């Protein structure tokens, strides 16, 4: 694992458990799981291992980081969460947004991603430009997830299945529509649809398509399309790692 999780107080631990339950009801009612998942992923995916900059350290709430074009629309997510966060002043924003990401997966029917508290809020956003480009292919994915974040090729494929919930918006990225027929249900449908090719009303980004043609990504796509249990396992492993980049000695 390579992780040493810090100690937090009993009151901090109580606030986590209470916030997890409040976040479930809220995120379920507001129907905003995919947006919250996108928020935690964009917050965490700025980590660069060589410099140990970026990562899930609460800087995504900064107007400066929200302005990054890859984060178009995430100011909505931040705004939605601010009243709830105010009820848990003991929690770092880093912990709160990561926990909201975990919850987003859980309440849509997804795996139970393990959560460890202790992220401290960092003073300055990372540089813009570290997040992936939907028009690019497999070398780019490996640059971003592997060379920067330090994730594996398996992680890239499983985390891409994050697209099993939610949708693109032509006013945000310019892409438009859901990847799946059930955008509020977390399951292995992203991989099913990607394999079955194009279907009316359904989205596939070039970055999604790049997974089909890579000798390593493709068998993972196939495995996940065949076995949702194996997708859920690899997904929970990868999300945990992502949510913990630069935190607790990795
Ligand atoms: C593999 C590289 C990736 C690229 C190029 C990419 C790109 C995109 C784009 C362009 C959108 C639509 C933005 C919009 O117009 O609203 C989107 C949405 C989304 N992404 Fe990704 N993404 C990637 C990976 C991931 C990962 C790793 C996760 C989390 C595990 C994730 C979770 C989501 C979710 C849940 C949505 C829907 C947001 C909503 O419904 O509002 N994506 N992604
Ligand atoms: K789905």
What pairs with residue 53 in β-bridges? 48
Residue 79 alpha carbon to ligand 2 centre in Å: 25
* Ligand 1 atom 11: residue of nearest CA: 168
Which residues are CB-neighbours of 120 under 8 A, at least 6 positions away? Answer: 57, 92, 94
Residues in Cβ contact with 121 at an 8 Å cutoff, skipping those fewer than 6 apart = 57, 58, 59, 92, 93, 94
CA of 186 from ligand 2 middle (Å) equals: 5
Active-site residue identified among 42, 68, 116, 239: 42
Categorise residue 244: left if φ over 0, alpha if ψ from -120 to 50, beta otherwise.
Answer: alpha
Of 32, 104, 102, the C-alpha closest to 73 is 32
How far is the C-alpha of 5 from the C-alpha of 139, rounded, in Å?
33
Question: Helices in the chain by DSSP H: which ranges?
Answer: 10-30, 33-44, 63-66, 74-86, 93-107, 138-141, 153-160, 189-195, 206-209, 217-226, 228-243
Taking the alpha carbons of 220, 221, 224, 227 in that order, is the dihedral positive or negative?
negative
Tell me phi and psi for residue 245, to 5 degrees: -55, 130
Rounded CA-CA distance 187/209 in Å is 19
What number does CATH give the domain 132-238? 1.10.420.10
62 is catalytic: no
Sign of CA dihedral 250, 165, 160, 124: negative
What CATH code would you report for 1-131+239-250? 1.10.520.10
Token pair listed for 144: 């971003």
Q: Where are the domains of the chain?
A: 1-131+239-250, 132-238
Q: Ligand 1: which residue has its CA nearest to atom 7?
A: 134
- Residue 176 CA: nearest ligand 1 atom is 15
Q: Identify the CA nearest to 81 among candidates 98, 60, 97, 103.
A: 97
Contact, 25 vs 105, CB < 8 A? no
Binding residues for heme b: 41-42, 163, 167, 169, 173
């Amino acid at each position: 694992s390579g992780k040493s999780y810090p100690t937090v107080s009993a009151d901090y631990q109580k606030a986590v458990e209470k916030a997890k339950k409040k976040l479930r009801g809220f995120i379920a009612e507001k129907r905003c799981a995919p947006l919250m998942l996108r928020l935690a992923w964009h917050s965490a995916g700025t980590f660069d291992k060589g410099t140990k900059t970026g990562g899930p350290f609460g800087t995504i709430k900064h107007p400066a980081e929200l302005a990054h074009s890859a984060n178009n629309g995430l100011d909505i997510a931040v705004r939605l969460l601010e009243p709830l966060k105010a009820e848990f002043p003991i929690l770092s924003y880093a912990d709160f947004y990561q926990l909201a990401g975990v919850v987003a997966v859980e309440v849509t029917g997804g795996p139970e991603v393990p959560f460890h508290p202790g992220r401290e809020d960092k003073p300055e956003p990372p540089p813009e430009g570290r997040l992936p480009d939907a028009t690019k292919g497999s070398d780019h994915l490996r640059d971003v997830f592997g060379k920067a974040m330090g994730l594996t090729d398996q992680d890239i494929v499983a985390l891409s299945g994050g697209h099993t919930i939610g949708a693109a918006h032509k006013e945000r990225s310019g892409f438009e529509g859901p990847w799946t027929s059930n955008p509020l249900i977390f399951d292995n449908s992203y991989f099913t649809e990607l394999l079955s090719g194009e279907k009316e009303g359904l989205l596939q980004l070039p970055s999604d398509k790049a997974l089909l043609s890579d000798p390593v990504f493709r068998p993972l796509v196939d495995k996940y399309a065949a076995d949702e249990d194996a997708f859920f396992a690899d997904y929970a492993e990868a999300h945990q790692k992502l949510s913990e980049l630069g935190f607790a000695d990795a």
